[PDB]
Design a protein around this ligand. Structure first.
Ligand code: NA
Ligand code: NI
Lengths: 168, 168, 168
């Protein structure tokens, strides 16, 4: 049998796991919100401060959080509306300070002005993120993905874009 | 050090928080399901019964749950298929009976008949909801949002809508 | 009042419920990932091994997990890109080893080659799943759904599909 203290110890471990899972789901939510909102300084706070990290998605690789946000600010300019919509996470806490997260991504991109005016891009991907916990806080260290599909097309210029946060 | 009783107290607070977070995520799920299903009486049960509430999204404002559902029933008639798809919540429990929830919304609207026949509307938004807990149950009090984008367009009438719950 | 032991018992029940809810959300995530990835052997591991189960969605009915995956492999061939995107779950744990889960589905299907080349199908549905727990593990037993809508259309062959995991 188990004493009351043993049962408390078990509960403490279980609750810590659930708390970590929830913290990670909110971290990834914040990442997507900052990414699509183009809130680059805030997005930087989701990335690990441990610069032993190579900040990579398996394709693109950078050596600091600032390098990541400098790339993104250039790659995702005001003329590009983006939606990165995460679904159905599978978060595994791997240790006291490491974890893995599978996410099912849908992405939609719309170029409103410039050289790529009226280009639309839609896709899907399976991401597997790696996270680390530093001084009580979870951060994103790196990821990899399989692209389910991606399509590029020209949007009808007669479509009426009635709202655009990057103009308003 | 902490006694067993102190450790139990800590666990009770942590579990209550996680339970509240889960209750809120299910509440918002029910809201979207009732909204798109046009189950207006059921949707009304998700809204706070505290009529000190101004029921607002920052744009539209009503003074009771019934006023909200009367508006929605008129604004979202049988001829309008709607999908409001929530993603990546960030739920913060603010007190014993208040909370905040960020949600990443995609919306798709299709008009099948009437004056707006063949109109499609797609968009995205960042919502920040406010919730309150009354007699053990969570309710939605009000929200605000930033529209990421919105587009209006005419759908090809050659598209075959093979299923529509609002006709069947 | 409650003794420390009673308070521990209450916490054990609450944490087990939250653990079950999280296990179910990850189970359904795995189902969708395997479905769209066409990982049929892995998908089979999400289905209940209890063959007193009729494996049904209310429309299609099979009598073993293998029959389910044989159907799916034929129905969802390499020429069909699929995305089944789950949102906003409402998971109810019904007993120590049974549960119910509402899911808000968006589906997108694209045929790239064959007889249905350039067909696209988009839809939405409200699913209510039934789960069972066998030897510590949750499985999907069966489901039912209401189709919000479904549309069939021919895609412009000028669209550029730049990535497709089922060719790569
Ligand atoms: Na979508
Ligand atoms: Ni979605």
């Amino acid at each position: 049998g188990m004493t009351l203290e043993a049962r408390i110890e078990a509960l403490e471990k279980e609750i810590q796991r659930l708390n970590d899972i929830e913290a990670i789901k909110q971290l990834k939510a914040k990442y997507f919100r900052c990414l699509d909102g183009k809130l680059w300084d805030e997005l930087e706070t989701t990335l690990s401060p441990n610069i032993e990290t190579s900040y990579s998605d398996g394709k693109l690789v950078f050596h600091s959080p600032k390098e990541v946000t400098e790339y993104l600010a250039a790659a995702m300019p005001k003329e590009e509306i983006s939606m990165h919509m995460g679904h159905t996470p599978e978060i595994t806490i791997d240790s006291e300070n490491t974890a893995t997260g599978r996410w099912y991504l849908e992405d939609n991109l719309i170029f409103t002005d410039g050289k790529y005016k009226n280009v639309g891009i839609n896709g899907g991907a399976f991401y597997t993120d790696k996270y680390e916990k530093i001084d009580g806080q979870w951060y994103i260290k790196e990821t990899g993905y399989v692209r389910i599909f991606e399509e590029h097309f020209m949007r009808d210029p007669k479509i009426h874009i009635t709202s655009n946060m990057h103009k308003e």
